[PDB]
Amino acid sequence: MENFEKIGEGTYGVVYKARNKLTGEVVALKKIRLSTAIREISLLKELNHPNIVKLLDVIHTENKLYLVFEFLHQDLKKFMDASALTGIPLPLIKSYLFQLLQGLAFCHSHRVLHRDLKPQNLLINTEGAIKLADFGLARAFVVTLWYRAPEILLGCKYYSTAVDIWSLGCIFAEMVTRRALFPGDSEIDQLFRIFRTLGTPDEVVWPGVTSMPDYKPSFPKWARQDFSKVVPPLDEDGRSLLSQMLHYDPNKRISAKAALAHPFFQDVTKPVPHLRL
Numbered sequence: 001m002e003n004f005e006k007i008g009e010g011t012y013g014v015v016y017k018a019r020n021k022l023t024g025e026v027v028a029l030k031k032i033r034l035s036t037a038i039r040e041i042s043l044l045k046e047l048n049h050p051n052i053v054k055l056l057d058v059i060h061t062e063n064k065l066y067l068v069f070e071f072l073h074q075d076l077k078k079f080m081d082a083s084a085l086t087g088i089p090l091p092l093i094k095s096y097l098f099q100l101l102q103g104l105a106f107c108h109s110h111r112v113l114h115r116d117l118k119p120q121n122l123l124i125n126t127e128g129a130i131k132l133a134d135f136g137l138a139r140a141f142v143v144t145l146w147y148r149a150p151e152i153l154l155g156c157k158y159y160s161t162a163v164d165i166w167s168l169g170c171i172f173a174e175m176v177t178r179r180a181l182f183p184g185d186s187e188i189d190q191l192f193r194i195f196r197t198l199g200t201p202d203e204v205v206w207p208g209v210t211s212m213p214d215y216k217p218s219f220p221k222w223a224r225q226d227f228s229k230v231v232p233p234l235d236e237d238g239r240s241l242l243s244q245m246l247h248y249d250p251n252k253r254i255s256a257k258a259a260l261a262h263p264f265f266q267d268v269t270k271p272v273p274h275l276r277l
């Protein structure tokens with residue numbers, strides 16, 4: 001009431017659409033009901049890029065943290081559902097993947113990881129842009145497992161930039177096929193869905209995997225499927241890029257900067273989506 005409608009529930013709290021009393025601007029206010037996290041989150045006010053949802057302010061009051069963001073009108077999950085009968089056109093999938101890779105390459109260059117990328121934290125506007133929301137929040141602080149990289153599911157506690165490339169690969173596949181790639185409903189179901197598609201990992205494709213905290217020698221041994229079966233009708237360039245984003249070994253997975261130079265983006269453009277708001 002001093003300085004200012006519910007949108008829904010997010011990973012760290014409730015998000016509201018609100019009007020700033022001093023400026024008249026419409027913003028998204030995220031209330032995180034609860035000192036190290038305050039300094040860390042406050043530093044993200046400097047992590048500004050056209051493909052990163054702007055964090056305007058970080059307020060600590062009455063033992064609660066409020067994050068004030070730029071407001072966007074739709075998320076990618078709602079846009080994919082709106083497009084379920086025809087699919088998103090390939091040039092717009094390409095544009096959105098390219099823009100998300102630019103946003104990741106910027107954050108990764110500043111050593112900031114997301115760790116929890118998913119369609120609900122990718123927001124779009126009427127000008128053809130897509131933006132990443134919530135970078136840096138996981139480090140400072142049902143939850144979907146569908147986009148979680150296999151090193152996280154296998155108990156590695158040292159995250160690298162590769163976890164975000166894996167999640168983006170999963171989202172890319174879901175834009176093309178109109179279905180989630182690995183819709184697990186438990187940690188083991190998530191792992192076994194990844195293993196049934198990509199094959200059970202072993203020391204040949206992922207050195208050190210058998211020494212991971214949650215690796216079990218008793219995991220079933222599935223053979224790998226071809227990407228031509230997984231994401232039809234994506235062309236050879238797109239399937240090659242997806243295969244590099246879903247390598248098991250996080251050291252082998254393509255970086256966001258290298259992905260921007262992939263042949264799949266030779267003809268990239270920026271189409272304008274028709275949005276129904």
Ligand SMILES: CC(C)[C@H](CO)Nc1nc(N[C@H]2CCN(S(C)(=O)=O)C2)c2ncn(C(C)C)c2n1
Nearest residue numbers: 008009010015028069071072073074075078133
């Ligand atoms: C509660 C959810 C997690 C939601 C995403 O569905 N969060 C959300 N929504 C925003 N805008 C909504 C407006 C209506 N659409 S929708 C639900 O119809 O797709 C998106 C939004 N603008 C900026 N931010 C910041 C905090 C990252 C936002 N965070």
